[PDB]
Ligand binder design. Structure first.
Ligand SMILES: CCCCCCCCCCCCCCCCCC(=O)OC[C@H](COP(=O)([O-])OCC(O)COP(=O)([O-])OC[C@@H](COC(=O)CCCCCCCCCCCCCCCCC)OC(=O)CCCCCCCCCCCCCCCCC)OC(=O)CCCCCCCCCCCCCCCCC
Ligand SMILES: CCCCCCCCCCCCCCCCCC(=O)OC[C@H](COP(=O)([O-])OCC(O)COP(=O)([O-])OC[C@@H](COC(=O)CCCCCCCCCCCCCCCCC)OC(=O)CCCCCCCCCCCCCCCCC)OC(=O)CCCCCCCCCCCCCCCCC
Ligand SMILES: CCCCCCCCCCCCCCCCC[C@@H](O)O[C@H](CO[C@H](O)CCCCCCCCCCCCCCC)COP(=O)(O)OCC[N+](C)(C)C
Ligand SMILES: CCCCCCCC/C=C/CCCCCCCC(=O)OC[C@H](COP(=O)(O)OCCN)OC(=O)CCCCCCC/C=C/CCCCCCCC
Ligand SMILES: CCCCCCCC/C=C\CCCCCCCC(=O)OC[C@H](COP(=O)(O)OCCN)OC(=O)CCCCCCC/C=C\CCCCCCCC
Ligand SMILES: CCCCCCCC/C=C\CCCCCCCC(=O)O[C@H](COC(=O)CCCCCCC/C=C/CCCCCCCC)COP(=O)(O)OCCN
Lengths: 178, 156, 606, 459, 98, 128
């Protein structure tokens, strides 16, 4: 969610992700904590059995048949954390998230209430306006001629610089905005 | 600012036309394959894989998070069918053609058994209920001028 | 004038006053939910009086107060039927709504639109009262579609969540299919009986044909989520828990059953539709019960329980026991609303978690919720001298002793065992054992709103069966003579369900692991009905709607035949006519041709 | 009828002699006043129509249509003055003049006593509409749309002219009263078959009948907002009114000449409703919905029963109000984001709540929620069709479902979900837009209380 | 494994900025600067509406035929009519299977 | 070993069950890097306008415009009368019309000749 993805997953990343998925589905099957703990240790052991394999081909085939086993034996209804992409509360509070630019269309009578908040907002807007050009120039400096290669962004490097393209990351609404 | 050569055109047959088309849609020429050139009218537009929007990575940082789309990326011809309020093509635990067999078998078995139980009802070892006044002849619609046939019951 | 009519109409009238005050200053304050709750409680206590009048003298009435419009031989009037069904269902619904609104004042406290939520609940209650008291089919259709739209708006409460919008549109789609049959019934009744009111329909239909009854059956199947059109009720658990507790468990869902009960004089004259109703009900109760025993979400389990009980109501309509079916609707409201409120208190205490696999030992941590859910589970299973017992044990007795389809009877018994099993699963998983939830324990059920609402429905679930059963005239010739084994059939089946579910649940502590049976996968994925029926027809319809209707016909062939052909032909003829080289030799030569033709094929002809 | 007509004409020099900054105010005020005066034609005798004079008469069929026209003019003025702000004074006066001439032609057409005058005014409505579309249309495609709108209409209406003059030569009159009282059966001959077709096809293409409907998405989508409003609310109803009038001289031939048009209208009802499910343009969706509704009206008129005529009248009025409201709602968002694509702006309920309420109410009347008059008309037509044949319920039932589907689809796509992150120029709703929506909606709701007014002559 | 130097540094800078923004979303003690009977519910919500309805039913609705129809009251053997003072005789001397 | 999962149209093949992602060659990795680069260049172009302080309005997307144009206006220029196009057009265009004509004409003929026989149960049917 926060990190730039890479062009591909390594064998090691695939193996770790399969480890996590197998553990979570096993916990879904093994409801109770002790029984899950037992079978999770058995899983870790069966996983460690092929830990130090040097033949890449046989390691790949082990991973492949392990994925086939996981698919045949997965839980049809695994546990999902409530705010996770399948959870019962996944996007529950998206109707409460209002972008900050809406505050500029407020009537002056609405901004009469909350004077301090809006003064501090004018300060933030000044900051963004005075940082933008340095951000653009820095991004043009640090980027190869054939366009960027990944979605990674550089930090600030000078005295009063801000990390380029920061406004919509810093001014997110909230995750419980009301 | 979207000029004339930004727009879908006719089916490309020369490889240079295929290169221009793949670049116009922001694709690799190795990835870009148009629809077959029948007279359907698809033309220039690319034939993308037929996965749903539900199949995309929900943990990625999409420009349009609920649509799960990135700005400037080629859009599937059937996006509005796959918006994930709608047709889902996500892989299932049990195979299609196995879910179909089980569902059809369950329903056919239930219908067959209901027809059977219609042929072979359940009842109690009882005689038909008896009602006093010629089986309530005047009560169930009457016509009091036509002398019904005497329905008379006897004790037992 | 007799008080009976004034009070029955005032009961429904005062419910509209907080809606009128919606634009008023009270709405913008935090006093609005309490105000709506108080209004509903006053409406309940007022509706208690006509119930007393009926229970004393059997008073019934119809009120055609306002004439709306008249089409030549048909008169449409705002008319209210105030028979036994209306005066008995109004106080029950008002009581349940009062409890659920007091519960909502706590459950929905941090919602920023709690006032709108209360307004929406009230709108649903008004439309349900319209549905229930309607005397003609047009007013009943108004109430029908009104509760449909309030369901749509309340399921998609959190409108930023895509799954909520999907579930709301799904409810609308399934209901529309059901509506088709409703409209068919209306059209038949007008072109054959020349009326839409119940009175004229009863007089003129002594031998009711198949078509209007099959329309009514399609409508009831849609509204009550029967096996063809069932999947929308479990997916309607997307809405907030109070919506589920009132709209989808005890009140709106029984409308299809109530529609079939309103027309029982016509259905008792047709054995084919009775067989169809009984069979549809039997499959639905068994199937829903089967799906429920493997679900891990608590709201899904209770929703499948609701679908199963609706199927039972349909089977008791099928054996020609309309009054018995109505009694169950009243009985089931109490304890099913209470079950949903208990699940909601659990969910809120455990940080909005609904999976029972993360609910541990709450039997001690939530003592009052545990007591209430146990009593509701015992009422659901037909424990003797409880609200569930009068309604369900009589239904099983009547299904055992009637000339009925044998398969329907067997499925009903298996479903009666399934009910015990799912109830056992919830209690064993959610209240017994060791905690399985995160370590920051926020469990707290010490709020007077929650306690008072649940205690009110608890007293209901304990005593309402006895009181109601003893305070109404007998409309049913009671089964007094049956074999002892048959008499104990409901009890024997329930104990079997108890024991076997408890055995298979106790065997999950063992440190032994096996992969799932194919019957398990069938039960858990809901018979694969949503996996197939929600993908195949939708894909094919949307695909043909773009490829054939839109593109092949509008954009191509209808263009080709009329306008493009005209353009092409006129363009060709213009090019042929106008492209002359301007040489007089050629023009003059043609003039000679023309002159020769006229003096031969025109001058020789006179 | 002169009392309604002269003031409408007066509106013309009143707007040509007004100050540059008062044209909208003056036109709106006096349009509303004219609408109020017209409201007095709803008093109907019962047995017969009100015959003001030899040239004009009003009916119970006619009265609802006239009130809707006069009421639609001020709404069109409110909807226009936003996107016409940059325009010169003379061109603004010309636009208002086009709208006034259109209203004048429409009022006369509905009340003309005889067919030749009806034909002339019914055809005169083409010129201002074409000028509005092609001169003030936003897109390049407007020119093509104008040609489609003109040619489809004239190809139907010229055979009608020939048929009408022939009928007056054989009968001696085209006055509608004489036409009705001296009606005689149409024999079953090739001559009579082609007379029937020439009397029917113009009104069929105006409705539009499915398969002759291709002009409507073009013209309704490429027009400015007021052009679209008047094209959907009133101009489609010329076909229905004309057909209801003309089918009195066509019996008993209609009994079997109606079969292909009934088949086209029922199946194309299903077709256009399905098309609405896969539409990327928001105006295109509202246009096809109009087509689906008018197919229902065509069925009602072809089966020729009192219940079907009542349902057709009610559905015409209700559609006119609802379709205009939906077009105005779409235009507000278009004004914000300058694109017609439906998925461009999403989650607008978070940014504009009262406009979301207007959206919900318009979508609820579009799917004919009881007891709205949309459902009154649809239910009456469905009952008449059931009497005509019990198998029509399958088609009617299917249509009801697809309509609910695409109506709520439009609502959910535009109002729900999350807002597009990039668009930040969505300003609060203006008082003008909210008042325009309310002035569409309040009259529809008010009509439910007194259903008989929009029911028609058969009532 | 883990972040790169630039990744960690940028996350730290963005973190400081975001925490300052969240801190400054707080309200000061004055922010919402706003510019300048016991039985009353049962009488306006129950008593007034029942006055209007009972008036409406008693003098308007029941001023027309067949608008309020009550199913006729049950009569039993041994009952006494109120209007005529009739007495319906009792019911035929049961066989008395006590 | 275990029963196999076979994909279909409406339930596709999972990525971990795809033999293609376990048979990797250097050309595959170069293709993946090219795709990532294209995604990256597009992302930067979008974020430079998204974060711009002076930018007010709706960022215009040429991919969306291409989609709507291809779905509406580019369809007829790319149409050819083909055996497939013609047969499908005839079928989906006039088939249903004649089907429904046959159904309704048959039903109404039955009903009318039934009325001529004096046999329909039309009592109480005043409204039509
Ligand atoms: C007298 C009769 C008494 C016997 C009645 C049933 C006895 C117990 C049932 C199974 C027990 C068992 O041994 O479990 C093993 C195994 C358990 O699964 P698992 O692998 O342990 O689960 C994985 C985890 O444990 C998953 O763990 P979990 O956490 O998900 O827990 C699962 C959950 C749920 O448990 C399950 O996962 C299993 C669910 C399937 C079993 C459902 C039982 C009811 C079946 C009704 C079928 C009606 C007809 C359907 C016809 C369909 C035809 C296609 O456990 C529970 O909470 C309790 C479940 C219910 C237990 C109590 C059942 C009581 C009702 C049945 C007895 C009724 C007695 C009174 C009869 C009154 C009339 C005389 O399931 C089986 O092997 C038995 C399946 C039998 C299915 C038969 C369905 C009937 C029709 C068959 C076809 C007929 C025609 C031929 C085919 C067509 C040819 C053309
Ligand atoms: C049935 C209840 C009876 C209540 C008695 C008093 C009713 C007076 C209302 C008069 C008409 C309403 C005007 C409609 C435009 C809304 C204006 C507005 O913007 O609100 C701003 C205002 C200020 O709120 P805010 O805090 O600033 O923020 C508002 C936000 O925009 C968002 O705030 P929001 O989310 O709360 O949305 C506002 C609201 C407003 O949106 C609406 O959709 C309201 C209109 C209902 C649907 C319209 C089309 C459906 C076809 C039905 C046609 C019936 C018309 C009958 C004649 C009416 C004469 C005008 O939306 C809804 O609440 C959901 C609507 C779903 C209604 C489904 C009911 C189906 C039929 C029910 C029975 C109809 C026949 C009655 C007799 C039957 C036999 C006894 O909000 C309100 O005042 C709420 C409106 C009250 C809800 C009325 C719903 C039922 C009334 C239907 C017609 C009345 C019949 C009276 C006859 C006696 C019975
Ligand atoms: C895409 C949308 C376009 C708009 C739709 C327009 C619909 C127009 C269709 C007209 C409806 C029917 C027309 C005439 C009714 C019957 C037609 C004929 O086939 O019936 C038989 C007629 O017999 C034969 O069929 C003769 C007609 C065959 C020649 C016509 C060619 C039809 C081919 C289809 C071409 C498509 C026409 C539309 C162009 C777009 C009846 O037998 P008969 O009792 O003896 O004749 C009755 C007339 N009498 C009494 C004077 C004797
Ligand atoms: C009788 C007349 C009508 C009969 C039915 C004809 C076929 C109807 C086909 C409907 C086509 C509609 C296409 C557009 C729908 C919009 C897209 C859509 O809804 O997506 C599917 C959407 C999302 O899927 P979920 O699983 O809920 O997602 C959860 C996880 N995200 O789910 C749905 O709403 C699909 C609903 C389709 C229903 C089709 C099956 C119904 C069959 C009924 C036959 C039996 C009738 C009952 C008989 C009762 C006894 C008399
Ligand atoms: C309010 C506060 C003031 C209280 C003082 C009023 C006291 C009672 C006075 C009653 C009004 C006078 C009166 O009775 O006139 C009768 C007059 C017309 O006579 P009707 O037979 O009812 O119908 C006309 C066709 N014949 O009726 C009235 O106007 C008063 C009663 C109207 C009731 C309110 C309307 C309720 C229904 C609203 C419409 C709902 C949509 C349509 C649903 C259709 C369902 C089939
Ligand atoms: C935007 C597309 C709309 C297309 C509409 C086209 C169809 C219009 C209907 C037919 C048009 C011509 C009808 C003629 C006008 C009626 C006049 C009349 O009734 O006179 C008839 C004459 O009837 C004719 O002559 C008509 C013959 C047809 C000539 C023109 C053919 C044009 C194409 C005909 C088929 C198309 C009509 C339906 C197409 C609908 C659009 C798809 C009888 O008079 P007598 O000559 O005296 O006969 C008795 C004394 N012996």
């Amino acid at each position: 969610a926060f990190s730039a993805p890479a062009a591909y997953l390594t064998h090691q990343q695939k193996v770790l992700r399969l480890y996590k998925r197998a553990l979570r589905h096993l916990e879904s099957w093994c409801v109770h904590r002790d029984k899950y703990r037992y079978f999770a240790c058995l899983m870790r052991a069966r996983f460690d059995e092929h830990k130090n394999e040097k033949d890449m081909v046989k390691a790949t085939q082990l991973l492949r048949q392990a994925e086939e086993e996981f698919w045949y034996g997965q839980h049809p209804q695994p546990y999902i954390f409530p705010e996770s992409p399948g959870g019962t509360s996944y996007e529950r509070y998206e109707c409460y998230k209002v972008p900050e630019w809406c505050l500029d269309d407020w009537h002056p009578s609405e901004k009469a209430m909350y004077p301090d908040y809006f003064a501090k907002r004018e300060q933030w807007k000044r900051l963004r306006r005075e940082s933008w050009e340095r951000e653009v120039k820095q991004l043009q400096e640090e980027t190869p001629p054939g366009g960027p290669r990944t979605e990674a962004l550089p930090p600030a490097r000078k005295e009063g610089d801000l990390p380029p393209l920061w406004w919509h990351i810093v001014t997110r609404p909230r995750e419980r905005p009301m | 600012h979207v000029t004339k050569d930004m727009f879908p055109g006719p089916y490309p047959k020369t490889p240079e036309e295929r290169a221009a088309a793949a670049k116009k849609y922001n694709m690799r020429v190795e990835d870009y394959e148009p629809y077959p050139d029948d007279g359907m009218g698809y033309g220039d537009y690319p034939k993308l894989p037929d996965r749903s929007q539900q199949e995309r990575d929900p943990w990625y940082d999409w420009d349009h998070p609920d649509l799960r789309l990135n700005w400037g990326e080629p859009i599937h011809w059937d996006l509005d069918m796959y918006i994930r309020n709608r047709v889902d093509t996500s892989p299932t635990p049990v195979s299609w053609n196995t879910m179909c067999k089980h569902l059809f078998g369950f329903v056919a078995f239930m219908l067959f058994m209901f027809w059977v139980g219609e042929i072979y009802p359940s009842y109690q070892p009882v005689g038909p209920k008896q009602y006093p006044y010629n089986d309530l002849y005047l009560e169930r619609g009457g016509d009091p001028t036509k002398e019904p046939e005497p329905v008379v019951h006897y004790e037992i | 004038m007799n008080p009976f009519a004034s009070l029955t109409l005032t009961t429904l009238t005062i419910l509209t006053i907080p809606i009128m005050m919606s634009n008023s200053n009270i709405y913008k304050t935090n006093l609005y939910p309490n105000y709506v709750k108080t209004t509903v409680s006053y409406a309940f206590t007022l509706s208690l009086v006509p119930l007393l009048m009926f229970m004393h003298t059997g008073q019934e009435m119809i009120i055609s107060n306002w004439h709306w419009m008249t089409l030549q031989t048909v008169e449409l009037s705002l008319s209210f039927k105030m028979d036994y069904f209306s005066v008995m269902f109004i106080p029950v619904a008002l009581f349940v709504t009062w409890s659920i609104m007091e519960f909502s004042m706590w459950y929905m406290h941090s919602d920023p639109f709690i006032n709108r939520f209360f307004k929406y609940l009230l709108l649903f209650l008004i439309t349900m009262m319209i549905l229930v008291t309607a005397n003609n089919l047009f007013q009943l259709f108004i109430g029908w579609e009104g509760v449909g739209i309030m369901s749509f708006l309340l399921i998609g409460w959190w409108h930023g969540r895509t799954d909520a919008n999907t579930a709301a549109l799904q409810a609308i789609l399934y209901n529309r299919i059901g509506d088709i049959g409703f409209v068919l019934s209306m059209a038949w009744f007008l072109t054959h009986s020349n009326a839409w009111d119940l009175q004229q329909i009863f007089m003129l239909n002594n031998e009711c044909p198949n078509m209007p009854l099959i329309g009514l059956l399609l409508a009831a199947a849609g509204k009550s989520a029967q096996f063809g059109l069932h999947p929308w009720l479990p997916s309607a658990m997307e809405g907030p828990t109070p919506v589920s507790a009132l709209l989808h468990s005890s009140t709106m869902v029984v409308a299809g059953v109530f529609l079939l009960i309103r027309f029982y004089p016509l259905m008792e004259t047709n054995k084919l539709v009775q067989t169809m109703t009984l069979c549809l009900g039997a499959i639905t109760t068994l199937f829903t019960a089967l799906c429920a025993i493997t679900q891990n979400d608590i709201k899904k389990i209770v929703a499948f329980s609701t679908s199963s009980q609706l199927g039972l109501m349909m089977v008791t309509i099928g054996i020609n026991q309309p009054h018995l079916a109505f009694l169950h609707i009243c009985m089931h409201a109490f304890f099913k609303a209470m079950l949903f409120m208990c699940s909601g208190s659990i969910i809120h205490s455990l940080n909005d978690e609904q999976d029972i696999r993360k609910m541990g030992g709450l039997y001690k941590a939530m003592p009052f919720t545990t007591t209430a859910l146990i009593i509701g589970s015992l009422a659901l299973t037909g424990m003797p001298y409880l609200t569930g017992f009068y309604s369900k044990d009589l239904i099983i007795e009547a299904v055992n002793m009637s000339y009925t389809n044998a398969w329907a009877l067997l499925m009903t018994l298996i479903a009666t065992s399934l009910t015990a099993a799912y109830s056992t699963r919830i209690i064993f998983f959610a209240f017994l054992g060791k905690p399985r939830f995160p370590p920051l324990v926020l469990i707290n059920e010490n709020n007077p709103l929650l306690i008072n609402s649940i205690k009110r429905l608890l007293i209901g679930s304990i005593f309402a069966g006895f009181i109601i059963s003893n305070n109404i005239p007998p409309m049913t010739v009671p089964n007094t003579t049956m074999p002892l084994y048959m008499k104990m059939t409901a009890l024997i089946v329930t104990i079997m369900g108890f024991m076997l579910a408890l055995e298979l649940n106790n065997t999950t502590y063992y440190l032994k692991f096996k992969y799932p049976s194919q019957t398990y996968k069938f039960s858990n994925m809901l018979g694969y009905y949503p996996s197939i029926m929600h993908r195949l027809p939708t894909y094919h319809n949307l695909s043909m709607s773009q490829k054939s209707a839109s593109s092949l016909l509008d954009l191509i062939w209808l263009e080709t035949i009329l306008p493009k052909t005209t353009s092409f032909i006129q363009m060709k003829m213009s090019i042929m006519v106008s492209n002359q080289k301007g040489l007089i030799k050629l023009y003059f030569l043609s003039f000679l041709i023309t002159i020769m033709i006229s003096m031969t094929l025109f001058n020789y002809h006179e | 009828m002169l009392k309604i007509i002269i003031p409408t004409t007066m509106l013309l020099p009143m707007t040509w002699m007004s100050k540059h900054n008062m044209i909208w105010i003056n036109a709106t005020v006096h349009s509303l006043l004219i609408s109020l005066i017209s409201l007095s034609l709803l008093n109907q005798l019962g047995e017969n129509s009100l015959n003001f004079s030899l040239t004009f008469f009003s009916d119970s069929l006619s009265a609802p249509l006239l009130v809707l026209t006069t009421w639609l003019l001020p709404l069109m003025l409110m909807a226009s003055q936003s996107h016409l702000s940059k325009e010169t004074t003379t061109r603004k006066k010309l636009y208002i003049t086009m709208l006034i001439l259109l209203q004048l032609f429409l009022i006369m057409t509905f009340t003309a006593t005889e067919l030749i005058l009806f034909y002339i005014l019914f055809e005169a409505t083409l010129v201002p509409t074409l000028i509005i579309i092609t001169r003030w249309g936003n897109q390049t495609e407007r020119l093509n749309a104008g040609l489609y709108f003109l040619f489809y209409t004239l190809a139907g209406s010229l055979p009608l002219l020939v048929a009408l003059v022939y009928i007056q030569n054989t009968t001696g009159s085209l006055n509608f009263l004489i036409i009705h009282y001296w009606s005689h059966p149409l024999s079953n001959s090739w001559s009579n078959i082609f007379m029937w077709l020439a009397c029917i096809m113009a009104f069929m293409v105006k409705m539009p009948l499915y398969g002759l409907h291709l002009w409507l998405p073009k013209a309704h989508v490429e027009a400015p907002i007021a052009g679209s409003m008047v094209l959907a609310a009133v101009l489609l109803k010329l076909g229905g009114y004309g057909m209801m009038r003309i089918t009195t001289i066509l019996n008993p031939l209609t009994n079997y000449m109606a079969y292909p048009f009934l088949m086209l209208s029922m199946w194309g009802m299903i077709m256009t409703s399905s098309i609405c499910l896969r539409q990327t343009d928001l105006k295109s969706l509202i246009a096809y919905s109009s087509v689906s509704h008018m197919a229902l009206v065509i069925v009602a008129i072809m089966i020729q029963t009192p219940w079907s005529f009542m349902g057709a009248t009610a559905l015409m009025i209700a559609h006119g109000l609802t379709s205009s409201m939906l077009f105005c709602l779409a235009n507000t968002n278009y004004e914000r984001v300058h694109s017609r694509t439906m998925i461009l702006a999403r989650g607008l309920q978070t940014l504009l709540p009262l406009m979301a309420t207007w959206w919900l109410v318009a979508s609820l009347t579009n799917l004919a929620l009881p007891p709205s008059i949309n459902l009154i008309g649809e239910l009456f037509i469905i009952t008449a069709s059931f009497s005509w044949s019990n198998i029509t319920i399958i088609l009617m039932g299917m249509n009801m479902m697809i309509t609910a589907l695409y109506s709520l689809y439009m609502l959910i796509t535009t109002q729900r979900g999350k807002y597009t992150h990039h668009i930040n120029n969505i300003k609060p709703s203006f008082t003008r837009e909210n008042a325009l929506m309310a002035l569409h909606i309040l009259p529809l709701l008010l009509l439910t209380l007194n259903p008989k007014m929009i029911l028609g002559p058969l009532y | 494994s883990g972040y790169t130097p630039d990744e960690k540094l940028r996350l730290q800078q963005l973190r400081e900025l975001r925490r300052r923004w969240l801190k400054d979303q707080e309200l000061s003690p004055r922010e919402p600067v706003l510019p300048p009977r016991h039985s009353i519910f049962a009488v306006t919500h129950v008593l007034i509406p029942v006055w209007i309805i009972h008036y409406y039913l008693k003098y308007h609705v029941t001023a027309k035929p067949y608008t309020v129809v009550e199913r006729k009251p049950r009569i039993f053997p041994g009952d006494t009519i109120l209007e005529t003072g009739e007495v319906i005789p009792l019911m035929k001397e049961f066989p008395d299977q006590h | 070993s275990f029963p196999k999962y076979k994909p279909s149209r409406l339930a596709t093949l999972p990525a971990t069950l795809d033999p293609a992602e376990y048979d990797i060659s250097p050309e595959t990795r170069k293709a993946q890097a090219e795709r990532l680069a294209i995604r990256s260049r597009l992302k930067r172009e979008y974020l430079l306008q998204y974060n711009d302080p002076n930018r007010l309005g709706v960022i215009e997307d040429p991919a969306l415009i291409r989609w709507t144009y291809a779905r509406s206006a580019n369809i007829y220029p790319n149409f050819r009368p083909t055996p497939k196009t013609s047969l499908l057009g005839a079928l989906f265009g006039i088939g249903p019309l004649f089907f429904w004509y046959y159904v309704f004409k048959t039903d109404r003929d039955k009903k009318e000749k039934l009325i001529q026989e004096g046999k329909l149960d039309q009592t109480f049917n005043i409204s039509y």
